[PDB]
């Protein structure tokens, strides 16, 4: 995260870390949406342009973490990926359209004051909170500009108008995505950097005080606007996979 700050312990109990086994290091971010389901970007696991193809065994998930590296007894829990589900229509060759993936755990994880699932949107919530101007929140252990944050970072940023999203790049932004971030003339900066991909983009609903995941970090603006996966746009798919298992 760029221009963010150290998050408060348990400020995002749904944050999930995708830790690689060798080299042992952080791969991406993710969120906990249930006791057995983890949500992340598709390119965090499979991205041919970079010869990237991670199998379930190539890693695991560290849940309820705060520090970026230090192991955290009686705080973080580690799970084993049972199955990975990349979106069928996920295309990387053009613009990461439908850059989303589901990861099921071999064993359900218990919740705590540090580990707690986030709610997925719905047309009402989405249609009402997904509006340019409104600020969402992003978190992660991605780089900063040393460039390695000690603990999870946090930053809030505005949704940018689809029209503006378009002009800001030659990439054909689809409806399954939306861009967020500040305009150069805003002064204040802040965005998702490399390593924060697969991370949750959330909003606190005023109509019920609960936090909702509107997007997934697909293409951080820098370290221009960041591109995120439209979670509701793909909710249908999510369930289809859930009901399936």
């Amino acid at each position: 995260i760029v221009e963010g700050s150290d998050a408060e312990i348990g400020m995002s109990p749904w944050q999930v870390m995708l830790f690689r086994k060798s080299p042992q290091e952080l791969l991406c971010g993710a969120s906990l949406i249930s006791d057995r389901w983890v949500l992340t970007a598709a390119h965090c696991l499979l991205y041919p342009p970079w010869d990237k193809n991670f199998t379930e065994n190539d890693l695991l998930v560290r849940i309820g973490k705060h520090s970026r590296t230090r192991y955290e007894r009686n705080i973080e829990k580690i799970s084993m990926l049972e199955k990975i589900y990349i979106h069928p229509r996920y295309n990387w060759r053009e613009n990461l359209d439908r850059d989303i993936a589901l990861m099921k755990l071999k064993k359900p994880v218990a919740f705590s004051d540090y580990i707690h699932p986030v709610c997925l949107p719905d047309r009402e919530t989405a249609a009402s909170l997904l509006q340019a101007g409104y600020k969402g929140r992003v978190t992660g252990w991605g780089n900063l500009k040393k460039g390695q944050p000690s603990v999870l970072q946090v930053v809030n940023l505005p949704i940018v108008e689809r029209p503006v999203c378009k002009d800001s790049t030659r990439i054909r932004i689809t409806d399954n995505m939306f861009c967020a971030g500040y305009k150069p003339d805003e002064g204040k900066r802040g965005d998702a950097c490399e390593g924060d991909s697969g991370g949750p983009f959330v909003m606190k609903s005023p109509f019920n005080n609960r936090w909702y995941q509107m997007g997934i970090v697909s293409a951080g603006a820098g370290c221009k606007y960041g591109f995120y996966t439209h979670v509701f746009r793909l909710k249908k798919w999510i369930q289809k996979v859930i009901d399936q298992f």
């Binding site: 348990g10 540090y114 600020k135 005023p206 936090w211």
Partner: peptide
């Protein structure tokens, strides 16, 4: 899942995280 979105150390104790208000203000405008 039925208690999702509410933070054990924040909402559940009537506490506001360091900068969530900013988000609230966004809905308003400033």
């Amino acid at each position: 899942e039925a208690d999702c979105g509410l933070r054990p150390l924040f909402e559940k104790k009537s506490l506001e995280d360091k900068t969530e208000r900013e988000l609230l203000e966004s809905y308003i405008d400033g």
